[PDB]
Symmetry: C3
Subunit: 286 residues, 3 copies
């Protein structure tokens, strides 16, 4: 019944100020060191832990982030949930810089990253885990993020029920799919055209394997993406984009803080049990 | 003189296809195979079995030593490899309980050792650019299909038969797999994309196994079992157990069919295709 | 200016110019594929590096692209011209043609594809480089004009009728899918790449083109269309002989184009283009 919310801060959250620090935790996991020390505290009455994905100084690129250590360390400190941010590029006309997206789907183009806790090697947990991922996020937690935005007077656009003419910017998109590329380079026009033609909404570099390991760890995970603009190469463009992005960070902070409180206002007993049981029923070695 | 190797996937972690005559606990220049190799006979035809995932199924797809498994079978004199693969369906006419004798694939694996050749000190020297347009041994595919006919299993050929002749459960006479790295299953977004590309099924173990078999100069063919990973479970599991029994029958008949023919020319062509693919020569 | 040349299949033993000397270098990312041939084309300094090393013993996935590009950068190169042998995916690109690529779709993995990271084997930092149009456009148009000056047909599908495609020709644009190799594609894979609208398939363009931009160098590639499906003909020995002889004629044409391209580069001023190549690197630093 104990609820505790971990937060993985991406670009723009390299040193977040979400709450007063009660504890600063330098932790080691069986999969190595996390990206930085973990800061533990309280939002209202809800215990919370925050970790910068890229470390202080933003020195670790997307492909070298130790996703296993970050997720394992949050589990180890008792987290039941993880809320994560990520900065992204738009692939579709209705997703414009300054919007947010509460993702529900992804296509994985990453490689070379440790993406599972289990295996046959000495540095892994014993066993073979095949997790279902058809809808890869925790749906309850997704809806918390969306309600938090409604609660903070931020426009919410749901393409599954609202006319396109009701898409008022800036807005939180209530659903969406990301293609996760490995980085560090951005896509060619050729690549972006194909990703767009496949119906993908945004592009990012950090969602996978973070979302996958959160599920393997029995935790409820949801991501909120900040749409920004990486195409100033076609002047003063960068300051306008960075001013919009600073505003985006303010609003996502309010969304995150309100989502933590909304998580604590509910019972999660059966959802946490289901999270843990799904890990156990996915063991193919038995 | 033929010798048939068998790589058993999920459902064949402990095959018992024949009375064990001998065991081979071996290693290779590319590391340890998945498990000890079990030697025997089907009729008069020599046969060797190894479970792809090891006994107890402790080895995930991306950590299987495909190089070592293929090399160990080659080292014992195998001329053929028959493999099983458990798969999910991407298309309406492939339903749980069916089988596919694959003839195509789309590779989305990474991080696996997938060639015996290169410039690293521990590789075989040379640059091997092997053709893979039709990646399986066609003679051996048709053996698997014929074996299913001889064991009273429906065969469906969508090139020549109307959809109304697709009577389940059936062996699909051709098909393409997307091979994903795993260990996780696909998102709905990924499945939708793979389906829209026209791929029939999804698997995690076919590649690089098929590629390395051709590098080794061996005739390779795969029979996939269609099951249902996203689902209830009691009916799926009992159905999968029935499919395992059917594949066992197909494999034992296939070994006998192989031994019944001469393979001298096909084997020599297997070996010459390796030679002619050496760009360093 | 100073032009580096990375020669692929068909350029293992380069004899482009009156060779001055051969040079062995080291880089912070290891040794390059081979020693380098230093010389001159007119007044312009030129260096040549066989991508696969002499003997062609290094396969595409094991090429040390970082060391090759950084070696050329450390020798003062401002430009890199690369050749790449490729297969066609579309009806109008036939063996013997050439392609001055302007786009790619990347299917490589497991190669060192960036100079920057948090590991000791890399430069300190996080570099996020724009790649929307991944080649140097001025250098692309140099290769094309060099083909015109050498009386090689040039075909621009945006502006020319396909029946007005005279072979052998230089296609003025084109997209590559770069597969990791070493095996060739299945029919299923080729069909999907074709359906995506890709023009040719190769194994060596990426990360070479990405690292050249990371290094602040102007990079353009001329692909050589050849034929990899001799296994389909009833007379494969004769097929490979004919394909090999046509490929030999192609490398003669490409040598002409490369030599003319080097002189065309040295004839222009590149002060602002080079400056822009450098500032793009700097501004792509997300840690700074």
């Amino acid at each position: 019944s104990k609820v505790k919310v971990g937060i993985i801060g991406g670009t723009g959250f390299d040193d977040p100020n979400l709450f007063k620090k009660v504890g600063v935790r330098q932790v080691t996991t069986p999969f190595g060191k996390p990206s930085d020390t973990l800061v533990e505290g309280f939002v209202g009455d809800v215990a919370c832990v925050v970790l910068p994905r890229h470390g202080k100084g933003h020195l670790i690129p997307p492909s070298e982030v130790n996703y296993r250590a970050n997720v394992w360390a949050l589990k180890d400190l008792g987290c039941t949930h993880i809320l994560a941010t990520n900065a992204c590029g738009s692939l579709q006309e209705d997703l414009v810089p300054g919007d947010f997206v509460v993702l529900n789907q992804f296509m994985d183009k990453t490689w070379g990253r440790e993406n599972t806790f289990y295996g046959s090697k000495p540095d892994s947990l014993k066993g073979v885990l095949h997790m279902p991922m058809a809808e890869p996020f925790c749906e309850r937690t997704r809806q918390i993020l969306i309600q938090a935005a409604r609660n903070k007077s931020i426009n919410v656009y749901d393409k599954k029920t609202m006319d396109k003419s009701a898409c008022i910017h800036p807005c939180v998109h209530a659903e969406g799919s990301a293609v996760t590329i490995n980085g560090p380079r951005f896509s060619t026009r050729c690549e972006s055209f194909i990703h767009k033609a496949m119906g993908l909404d945004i592009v990012n570099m950090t969602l996978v394997p973070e979302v996958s390991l959160a599920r393997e760890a029995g935790l409820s995970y949801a991501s909120i993406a900040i749409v920004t603009d990486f195409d100033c190469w076609k002047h003063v463009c960068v300051d306008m984009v960075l001013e919009q992005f600073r505003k985006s960070v303010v609003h996502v902070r309010e969304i995150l803080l309100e989502a933590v409180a909304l998580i604590g206002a509910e019972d999660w007993t059966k959802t946490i049990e289901a999270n843990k049981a799904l890990v156990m029923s996915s063991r193919q070695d038995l």
